[PDB]
Design a protein around this nucleic acid. Structure first.
Lengths: 199, 114, 83, 384, 29, 227, 126, 315, 76, 147
RNA sequence: CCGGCGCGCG
């Protein structure tokens, strides 16, 4: 119906934390595709916000460069694993979550007690492994923000992994129309279509 | 004080004859090799790994064909690398494998045939 | 020392009686030139002429074939050598 | 025998070749005694015997599957004819041949056999330990009813080794396959590659190989194999001869390596009527060729010292034979023109040279582009 | 210096501008 | 012929074949000095093969297409230098030809080269028939066709981007032509160089020395230091 | 201070957001930008060979351990190795910008601030 | 102890200084130069910068100290037919180095003659010649024969000017171990040698099986001998650089004597790993890479690509 | 500002409502087997990648061969 | 930045006639060595010839390097980086696209073996060792130019 | 809070 249309020409879920999408937008007048592409690229790479863990509190740790008896990973590795958890939320503020389990076993991302406004993208993400029945209580801090940043966690809030666009001549030079393609890679916290709309 | 770097022992034809004649509790794996043979290096490393795996549950020995050429020809050796899997039971028959067979193949032969 | 190089592929044409035979510092037979010698290269398209200034070594022979950029003429302490 | 098989077709290019025998990983068959052994345990010294090899192992050959893989890598089409078991190792071998684009339609599976495994019984005859075969491996147990007549019809060259002569079943199957191949117009390529048993005595090996020798149109032997088959001691004495007072020519004063070219009169005992080409290989250094019309030698070279830590001579003879077949299938004038024959044999020389630069026979087989590049780099342009 | 050299390097001329022997906009300011 | 192709700049020999003469007979090595005699046997050089480059491959491709014609089958070094001097004009001609083909055939026919899963007829007449029968205009059909393109095909099609403007000759160049840029396969196989990114180094391999013994344990082993 | 293994040293003078860095034809921004004028005066061509082959290895999931003086096998041995591995990565991953027949090793990249391509192809790598 | 490369190259230095040796002011100007007897024994590239240039040397990869205080390098001997020559690799002292015709070329050349008459570059009596193969006595065949460890870690070194090779060797000794390490995509194959001989990784002293692994220890048991190997965790060097080890094996893995058990700092999988593989462009960008400046992206910062631990000591 | 907004409005618009099973191991007739190689098909994955439309297009391929291929695949 | 001059492997342009000239010098060096072995020339005549024939060849490549750049690749990055006067001179570009020429041993004398390859092609093991003679001089002469 | 020795950077 519309003279100018857009559509998702390919959608692909490579893994639980890597979504792909390609979109088309035609016909565009000459010069419009360049403006749309550059502004959309900069918005996708800089203006889309994400939700991340930013602060985790331990109880029986001298410093983040020490070990715990019965836990295979040191505190530094636990913090690095916590930094890789992909979250999703539409709200702002410093929400807090809880990790409170008893071993032995594997502590995955599904063991986090989240507030109702925050959701887990990948349940299988690894945090630590308990070899013997020890107590482990970790208090987390979660907020939604842009860009990047009790032990502080260097949180990278950008959920779009990469973006690309291409411009092609539509055909005969009646108005030298153009075809715009946009490729978006996300971490699963939002789909490429959601990233396009939010941008 | 210093552990030896190699667990596979080199035997003569007479020593191998005495070993086969005598009572055997674990499988005996006999390797025929020559230092001028290129494939025998990889077989040597594989057999070192196999000897590490089977600490006391198998016996890995090697015979040089430049010292026991006639003995190798008698034992029906047509080339190198060649392995002989000798079962501890005298009633059973030995198995000759020719080529650079995988380590898992050696494990299967030892487990389910000796 | 400046090297005159053949500007075209062709046949060297000059009279060897206007030059004096010598021996180069590299051990080669050559012709010493003390006059305004004219050397003709009969190339594939037309005949070309190369002017050889005096006090120069002419390293080529009459009717010899030469390639382009090939040296045809040359213009021009105490060490101990052990064999 | 009586009729034909399948449907006649124009057939695609390059012409197909068939390799008959056992498919094995590595397993150089030619084994003799060498007088310069390295440390029995430290295999890091054994590379020194790769750049100073025993003469019989200068360009070792292997199973026919090596020749098939090398031939395919050199731009040809090849099919392998043989039997493997139905276990994991047989499937692994067939997968190796398939990834190399070798036709495995001629491969017969045996679900009840263990691939590359032979049953033997150990006996103590006259005070010495010996073994005798109880059940042959599936690679030696291909029956004449298990052949693939389409492959034998399409194949223009039939290739086999003398390892099949150490098995009676494989011998009968080989002779039936040779009959089928000669019926359809193919050429028989005998690549001797004498295994360890066949070096016991000259007369026994001559009697064992005479029939297959006479059934072959193309024969490739090493210098050691040829001299063993004719007379080992005579040529050993001839090499050791030194003039007592003065040389007969200036070249004899240089004490260069001996590259003696056997006369066709010396080759006469081993010649027969259907033999179109005999090639004697002194590694990759010399390629002595003999045809009913002419004879000569192709001068080659080698450099394994250019890469001392990756050089390995295993599979070099397979590459030479594969290059010979590759040029024979596409250049029929080799059998009749001497200059063309030498020019095409330089390709096989280059292929053998490259194959010595990598650890592993299959892993190091060159491609046609690399072989042609090395041939043009080594030789002057007038010898191309 | 490279930027200025590229900026002030003028048109391709002669055989580097046209493939064949020839047997541009006008701006007010 | 000549004197007109030279005037117009059309492909022509540098030297007119009619106005060409041989170079007579030169010295026969019997009336020549020792230093100017051709060697009896050809000498190995390591410079006996001509160096591969981009210019030779592109000139051979353009001679195959008829855009230019060379003196022989293999372009000379003079022709290679001339192509290096004038190479932008031919690429611009190819780009203009591609633009004209896009304008003539239409987007559906032009871009179906990089959409192999599209089996419908892509001519303008077929597009108009589809629009009349279904109400889906050319843009809708174009969007539908690009919905079957793969990511590999899309990335290949990026050579037609208006900002990239990849050479059409290079886009359709085949592997056998491309390999001649560097001369083909290296004589030393690359498999010797290749190592797995996750490989763990085996220190008992053939390229390693024997395991270094503990100095104290080595002293005690040789019975030099008491317990 | 950062440096490569070819005597190419330098001080970090500027840090940009990823949307400001120049980016490739696959849309990925680069991590470092080096001055090309440092090669001719310093005469270290081996860094150009390494960056092109490092890019090829990352796409092909390969590592390369090459002994020095590989031209003892053939002329331009390093060029044949790098160009053929660049083309293999381009063909397998369907990334035609990785190997350009017009100018091997170099590709057109785009200005992250304007989205317009830089006029000349740029040698990129890893 | 900055990195594993510095631990091993320090012990292989040769100095003309010290008691009984010439001082920088004392040093003659004909010394500090390269002598033809150095080939294969002293690296011609590696030297100190400053007043002590040409007075602090460095041993080659294959160099050996003889029984007379002389340096030896191995050469491959080419002999006639009638000679046993059980081992053709003989170490050559500089005194006998001159009187051998040593070639460095290859034998991949053939014309209508025979191979022995092809000419190759060779060394004889401290000069460079071009003689036939039949007149060659020894061949130099090892790839890393003439270089030290520093120069042997430079890929495509034959395309770099030798002046920058000296600078490149020094810079590799100043590399900081990163909090996370990764192997180089392109190398020379000597990284595995450096890792093994530095002692930074854990090397098994006894064959057996892996039974337990964690941050603080690795437990290996073999032939009724159970050992426990501790792992260094965030220790300090003399240069304020962190030392740390992580396991490289899993429980249930069979181990040979001399095989790797764990990876140390600046070591991944048994190789020297002093840097990172990053996407790079070579172009001018608005003067922020003027002269030798480097423009980087924020991804290298918030990704912790070049983050390093530094530990100071206060007494 | 208005032109930019109009350029980014449309993105918010809504609308009204076998790799290792090879041909050789399969018992195929020689005529069908050789045709597949001429068209560069070596693995059963590639055989299933081609629709029946393209199978008939290649030379020396008939309708009978198409039916024979389906029966053998159904039996394995 | 807008033009973004760069530097690739194929931008390092050797003149088309290097292979012709290197083969010519190789043929003359092969002939003289045979006749020197014959006793038709003496050692100094052979020592002079090899040095001067390869110095003339090296110097001719340097002269033709610029007209090759000016006529066939005016916008070549190596040419622009030096012809504009920005960074680098003709001598250093010759080391990259021509040939490194001849070196000298510490005691003044020249080495009777040319470096006939450039840095783009890759020096041989023998040539790289010889080129280290000039590398040592530069660092040593720096320690005396300053003091 | 003084000098020697060793190692480095520009």
């Amino acid at each position: 119906t519309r003279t100018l249309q857009w559509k998702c020409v390919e959608s692909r879920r490579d893994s639980k934390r890597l979504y792909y999408g390609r979109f088309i937008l035609s016909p565009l007048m000459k010069g419009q595709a360049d403006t749309i592409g550059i502004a959309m690229r900069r918005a996708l790479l800089g203006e889309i916000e994400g939700t991340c863990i930013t602060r985790a509190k331990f109880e029986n740790i001298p410093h983040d460069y020490s070990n715990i008896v019965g836990i295979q990973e040191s505190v530094h590795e636990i913090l690095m694993n916590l930094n890789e958890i992909v979250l999703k939320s539409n709200l702002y503020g410093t929400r807090n979550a809880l990790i409170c389990v008893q071993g032995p076993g594997y502590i995955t991302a599904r063991d986090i007690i989240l507030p109702p406004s925050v959701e887990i993208v990948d349940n299988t993400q690894h945090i630590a492994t308990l070899t013997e029945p020890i107590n482990l209580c970790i208090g987390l801090k979660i907020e939604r923000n842009r860009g990047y940043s009790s032990y502080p966690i260097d949180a990278v809030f950008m959920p779009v992994q990469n973006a690309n666009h291409s411009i092609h001549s539509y055909g005969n030079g009646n108005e030298k129309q153009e075809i715009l393609f946009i490729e978006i890679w996300t971490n699963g916290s939002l789909t490429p279509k959601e990233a396009l709309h939010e941008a | 004080f210093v552990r030896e770097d190699y667990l596979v022992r080199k035997l003569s034809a007479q020593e191998l004859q005495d070993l086969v004649k005598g009572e055997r509790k674990v499988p005996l794996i006999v390797d025929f090799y020559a230092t001028w043979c290129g494939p025998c290096i990889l077989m040597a490393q594989e057999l070192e790994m196999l000897a590490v795996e089977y600490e006391s549950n198998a016996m890995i020995v090697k015979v040089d064909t430049d010292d026991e050429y006639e003995f190798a020809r008698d034992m029906q050796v047509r080339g190198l690398p060649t392995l002989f899997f000798i079962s501890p039971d005298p009633s059973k028959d030995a198995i000759r494998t020719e080529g650079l067979i995988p380590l898992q193949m050696m494990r299967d032969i030892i487990d389910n045939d000796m | 020392a400046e090297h005159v190089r053949a500007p075209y592929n062709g046949k060297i044409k000059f009279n060897e009686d206007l030059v004096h035979p010598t021996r180069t510092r590299h051990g080669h037979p050559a012709f010493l030139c003390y006059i305004d010698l004219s050397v003709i290269i009969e190339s594939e398209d037309i005949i070309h002429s190369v002017t050889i200034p005096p006090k120069s070594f002419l390293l080529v022979q009459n009717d010899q074939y030469v390639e382009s950029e090939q040296v045809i003429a040359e213009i021009r302490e105490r060490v101990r050598k052990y064999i | 025998v009586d009729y034909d098989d399948g449907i006649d077709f124009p057939y695609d290019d390059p012409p197909l070749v068939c390799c008959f025998g056992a498919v094995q990983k590595e397993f150089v068959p030619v084994v003799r005694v060498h007088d310069n052994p390295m440390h029995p345990d430290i295999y890091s010294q054994w590379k020194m015997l790769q750049w100073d090899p025993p003469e019989f192992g200068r360009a070792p050959g292997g199973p026919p599957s090596n020749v098939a893989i090398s031939h395919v890598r050199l731009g040809g089409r090849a099919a392998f004819m043989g039997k493997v078991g139905g276990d994991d190792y047989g499937e692994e071998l067939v997968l190796m041949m398939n990834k190399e684009r070798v036709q495995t339609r001629g491969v017969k599976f045996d679900e009840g056999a263990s691939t590359a495994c032979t049953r033997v019984k150990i006996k103590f005859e006259d005070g010495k330990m010996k073994a005798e075969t109880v059940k042959e491996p599936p690679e030696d147990s291909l029956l004449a009813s298990e052949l693939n007549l389409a492959v034998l019809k399409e194949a223009r060259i039939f290739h086999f080794n003398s390892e099949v002569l150490t098995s009676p079943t494989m011998e009968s199957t080989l002779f039936k396959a040779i009959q089928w191949s000669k019926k359809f117009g193919g050429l028989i390529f005998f690549d001797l590659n004498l295994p360890l048993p066949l070096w016991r005595s000259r007369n026994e090996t001559r009697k064992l190989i005479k029939k297959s020798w006479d059934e072959a149109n193309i024969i490739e032997v090493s210098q050691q194999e040829l001299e063993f088959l004719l007379d080992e001691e005579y040529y050993e004495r001839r090499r050791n001869y030194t003039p007592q007072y003065f040389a007969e020519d200036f070249e004899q004063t240089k004490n260069r390596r001996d590259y003696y070219h056997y006369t066709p009169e010396e080759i006469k005992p081993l010649w027969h009527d259907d033999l179109k080409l005999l090639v004697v290989t002194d590694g990759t250094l010399r390629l002595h060729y003999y045809t009913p019309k002419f004879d000569g030698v192709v001068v080659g070279t080698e450099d394994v010292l250019i890469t001392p830590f990756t050089c390995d001579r295993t599979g070099s003879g397979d590459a030479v034979v594969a290059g010979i077949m590759r040029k024979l299938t596409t250049c029929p004038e080799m059998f009749e023109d001497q200059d063309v024959l030498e020019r095409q044999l330089r390709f096989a020389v280059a292929a053998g040279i490259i194959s010595q630069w990598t650890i592993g026979a299959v892993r190091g087989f060159p491609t046609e582009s690399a072989t042609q590049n090395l041939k043009e780099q080594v030789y002057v342009p007038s010898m191309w | 210096l490279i930027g200025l050299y590229v900026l002030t390097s003028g048109t391709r001329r002669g055989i580097c501008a046209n493939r064949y022997n020839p047997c541009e906009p006008f701006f007010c300011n | 012929g000549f004197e007109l192709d030279k005037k117009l700049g059309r492909p022509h020999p540098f030297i007119d074949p009619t106005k060409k003469k041989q170079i007579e007979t030169t010295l026969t090595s019997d009336e020549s000095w020792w230093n100017w005699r051709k060697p009896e046997k050809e000498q190995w050089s390591r410079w006996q093969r001509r160096r591969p480059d981009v210019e030779t491959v592109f000139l051979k491709a353009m001679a195959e297409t008829g855009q230019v014609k060379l003196y022989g089958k293999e372009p000379t070094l003079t022709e290679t230098s001339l192509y290096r001097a004038r190479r932008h004009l031919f690429k611009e001609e190819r780009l203009q030809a591609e633009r004209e083909r896009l304008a003539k055939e239409g987007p559906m026919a032009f871009y179906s080269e990089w959409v192999k899963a599209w089996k419908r007829d892509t001519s303008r007449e077929a597009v108009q028939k589809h629009f009349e029968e279904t109400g889906e205009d050319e843009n809708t059909q174009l969007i539908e066709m690009f919905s079957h393109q793969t990511d590999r095909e899309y990335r290949i099609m990026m050579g037609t981007d208006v900002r990239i403007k990849r050479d059409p000759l290079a886009m359709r160049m085949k592997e056998d032509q491309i390999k001649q840029i560097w001369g083909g396969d290296p004589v030393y196989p690359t498999i010797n160089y290749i190592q797995a990114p996750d490989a763990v180094m085996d220190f008992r391999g053939p390229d390693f020395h024997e395991p270094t013994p503990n100095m104290l344990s080595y002293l005690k082993e040789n019975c030099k230091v008491i317990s | 201070k950062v440096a490569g293994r070819h005597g190419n040293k330098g001080i970090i003078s500027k840090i940009l957001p990823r949307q400001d860095m120049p980016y490739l034809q696959d849309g990925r921004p680069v991590d470092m930008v080096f001055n090309p004028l440092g090669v001719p005066s310093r005469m270290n061509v081996g860094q150009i060979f390494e960056c092109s082959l490092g890019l090829a290895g990352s796409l092909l999931d390969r590592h390369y351990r090459i002994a020095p003086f590989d031209e003892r096998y053939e002329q331009e041995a390093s060029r044949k190795l790098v160009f053929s591995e660049l083309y293999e990565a381009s063909k397998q991953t369907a990334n035609p910008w990785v190997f350009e027949p017009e100018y091997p090793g170099k590709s057109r990249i785009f200005d992250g601030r304007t989205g317009d391509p830089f006029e000349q192809p740029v040698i990129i790598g890893k | 102890r900055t990195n594993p490369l510095t631990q091993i190259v320090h012990g292989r230095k040769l100095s003309y200084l010290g008691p009984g040796g010439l001082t920088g002011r004392t040093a003659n100007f004909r010394i500090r130069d390269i002598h033809p007897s150095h080939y294969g024994r002293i690296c011609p590239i590696d030297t100190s910068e400053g007043i002590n240039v040409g007075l602090i040397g460095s041993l080659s990869i294959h160099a050996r100290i003889g029984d007379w205080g002389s340096l030896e390098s191995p050469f491959y001997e080419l002999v006639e037919k009638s000679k046993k020559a059980q081992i053709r690799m003989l170490f050559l002292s500089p005194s006998q180095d001159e009187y051998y015709m040593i070639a460095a070329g290859n034998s991949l050349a053939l014309n209508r003659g025979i191979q022995e008459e092809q000419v190759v570059p060779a060394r004889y009596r401290q000069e460079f010649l071009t003689i036939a193969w039949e007149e060659v006595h020894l061949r130099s065949i090892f790839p890393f024969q003439y270089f030290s460890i520093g120069a042997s870690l430079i890929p495509f070194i034959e395309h770099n000017d030798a002046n920058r090779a000296l600078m490149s060797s020094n810079m590799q000794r100043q590399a900081v171990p990163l909090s996370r390490s990764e192997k180089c995509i392109v190398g020379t194959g000597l990284e595995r040698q450096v890792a093994l001989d530095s002692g930074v990784p854990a090397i098994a002293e006894h064959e057996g099986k892996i039974l337990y692994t964690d941050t603080e220890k690795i437990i290996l048991s073999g032939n009724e001998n159970t050992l426990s190997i501790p792992l260094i965790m965030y220790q300090r060097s003399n240069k304020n650089t962190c030392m740390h080890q992580k396991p490289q094996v899993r429980r249930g893995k069979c181990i040979k004597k001399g095989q790797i058990l764990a990876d140390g700092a600046a070591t991944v999988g048994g190789e020297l790993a002093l840097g990172k593989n990053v996407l790079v462009a070579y172009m001018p960008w608005e003067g922020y890479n003027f002269e030798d400046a480097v423009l980087i992206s924020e991804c290298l910062v918030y990704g912790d690509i070049y983050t390093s631990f530094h530990i100071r000591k206060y007494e | 500002s208005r032109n930019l907004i109009n350029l980014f409005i449309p993105f918010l618009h809504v609308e009204e409502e076998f790799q290792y099973i090879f041909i050789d191991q399969l018992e195929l007739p020689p005529r069908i087997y050789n045709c597949l190689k001429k068209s560069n098909i070596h693995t059963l994955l590639d055989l299933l990648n081609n629709s029946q439309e393209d199978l008939i297009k290649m030379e020396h391929f008939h309708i009978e061969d198409v039916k024979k291929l389906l029966d053998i695949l159904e039996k394995k | 930045t807008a033009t973004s001059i760069s530097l690739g492997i194929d931008d390092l342009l050797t003149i088309p006639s290097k292979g012709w000239l290197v083969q010519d010098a190789e043929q003359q060096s092969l002939i003289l060595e045979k006749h020197h072995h014959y006793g038709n020339v003496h050692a100094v005549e052979k020592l002079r010839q090899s040095i001067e024939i390869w110095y003339a060849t090296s110097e001719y490549l340097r002269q033709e390097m610029n007209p090759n750049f000016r006529m066939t690749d005016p916008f070549n990055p190596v040419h622009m980086m030096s012809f504009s006067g920005a960074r680098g001179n003709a001598s250093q570009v010759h080391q990259l696209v021509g040939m490194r020429g001849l070196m000298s041993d510490p005691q003044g004398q020249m080495i009777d073996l040319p470096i006939q390859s450039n840095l783009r092609e890759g020096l041989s093991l023998t040539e790289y060792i010889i080129s280290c003679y000039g590398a040592r001089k530069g660092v040593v002469d720096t320690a005396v130019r300053t003091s």
